[PDB]
């Protein structure tokens, strides 16, 4: 099996800059007919892969001139001339020269943008969840960059670690930020034993934590 090592594993680049993805084969990859069947694909979190480049350097219809392929031997490169936001996704090289055809592991392209602090909001369980015996406290941290952020829950002043579920969006296509959802699930009985619920976020954009909180008796 020919293996395909891609480099790098993820690629942060600014708009307008240019990007280089490398794909290295563990054996030469000339087919018995003389051609090198090396392809590049872009996959977006939405979709199926779309062909960019076939036979090393040929562009597929409708792929813009900004993408170009080159290489030889065991060493292949995809260059992305003028990075646009639409170029977000995961790039793969692929060889169909020797069976089984094999893929590279993928490179993740991220858009490098300026730091942005999260906008944090907090929501107590709805009335309707509480009748089911359940209580999720939800905190949204919206539109921030870079992706790295820590979120802490406190209950009546006390850090709570278990029952916390986090979820990140992919990078937005409009503004290149990330968002995240943090949920603290409790029984109704445990939810009703405390008064104050706090969502605290530590982001490189500030040394002080952003705190959002509510008291069950405040409104």
């Amino acid at each position: 099996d020919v293996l395909m090592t891609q480099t790098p594993l993820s690629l942060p680049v600014s708009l307008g800059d240019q990007a280089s993805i490398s794909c290295r084969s563990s054996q030469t990859i000339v087919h018995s007919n003389g051609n090198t069947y090396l392809e590049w694909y872009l996959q977006k979190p939405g979709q199926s892969p779309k062909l960019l480049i076939y036979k090393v350097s040929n562009r597929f219809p409708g792929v813009p001139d900004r993408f170009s392929g080159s290489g030889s031997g065991t060493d292949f490169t995809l260059k992305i001339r003028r990075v646009e936001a639409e170029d977000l996704g995961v790039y793969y090289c692929f060889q169909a020269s020797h069976d089984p055809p094999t893929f590279g592991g993928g490179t993740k392209l991220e858009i490098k943008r300026a730091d942005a602090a999260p906008t944090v909001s907090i929501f107590p369980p709805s009335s309707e969840q509480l009748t089911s015996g359940g209580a999720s406290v939800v905190c949204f941290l919206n539109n921030f960059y870079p992706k790295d952020i820590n979120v802490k829950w406190k209950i009546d002043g006390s850090e709570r670690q278990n029952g916390v579920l986090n979820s990140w969006t992919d990078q937005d296509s409009k503004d290149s930020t990330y968002s995240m959802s943090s949920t603290l699930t409790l029984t109704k009985d445990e939810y009703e034993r405390h008064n104050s619920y706090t969502c605290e976020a530590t982001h490189k954009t500030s040394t002080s934590p952003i705190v959002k909180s509510f008291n069950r008796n405040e409104c």
């Binding site: 062909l51 995961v90 089984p100 055809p101 893929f103 969840q129």
Partner: protein, 212 residues
């Protein structure tokens, strides 16, 4: 144009058999073989094998010989993938793709192999919520199986200021959420509605966000 249309997502129990269809149009089906690819949850594409569309002669990758069968109906411009005796690790998205050197891909068919049953979600409105400049509302979609759920706001009418978060497994069941940010001079006088669809269980839920 050229398209490859695959059948929809599937839930099977370990041990069962799936057949997944790949329907081509836009070209002479019999001139171009059809590949099958597996994308396991996470990263990675793996080639399963190919089938010569004009003779129905298949070729399987080493790791795919035995439980897997390629077939065609020509006859219908359809190729099929059957997977027998399903285990956990057959959980993946399956693609058909045309040409030896491969060019066009189908849109993929996700297979979930699980003994967890089809289960409808509950939808909870998240209000701030009752009495600046900006308000953020949300929707909690709790306890469904399998993926996916479709979540829109109003009826697609709100697209701006929307974040829908990927589903996470919360003891056997999925949870997802969505937030939407609107002008404070909008809500609560213009109604805001979270519309949830769970095609597997045929659930359609509208939940109005009421101030608390």
């Amino acid at each position: 144009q050229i398209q490859l249309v695959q059948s929809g997502p599937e839930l099977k129990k370990p041990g069962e058999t799936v057949k997944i269809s790949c329907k081509a149009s836009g070209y002479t089906f019999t001139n171009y073989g059809m590949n099958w690819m597996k994308q396991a949850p996470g990263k990675g594409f793996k080639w399963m094998g190919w089938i010569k569309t004009n003779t129905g002669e298949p070729t399987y990758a080493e790791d795919f010989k035995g439980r897997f069968a390629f077939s065609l109906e020509a006859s219908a411009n359809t190729a099929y993938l059957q997977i027998n005796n399903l285990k956990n690790e057959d959980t993946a998205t399956y693609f058909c793709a045309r040409l030896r050197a491969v060019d066009y891909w189908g849109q993929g068919t996700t297979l979930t192999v699980s003994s967890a049953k089809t289960t409808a979600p509950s939808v909870y409105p998240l209000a701030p919520g009752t009495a600046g400049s900006s308000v953020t509302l949300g929707c909690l979609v709790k306890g469904y199986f399998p993926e996916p759920v479709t979540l829109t706001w109003n009826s697609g009418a709100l697209s701006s200021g929307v974040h829908t978060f990927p589903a996470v497994l919360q003891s056997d069941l999925y949870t997802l959420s969505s937030s939407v940010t609107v002008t404070s001079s909008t809500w609560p006088s213009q109604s805001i509605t979270c519309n949830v669809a769970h095609p597997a269980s045929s659930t359609k839920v509208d939940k109005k966000i009421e101030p608390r």
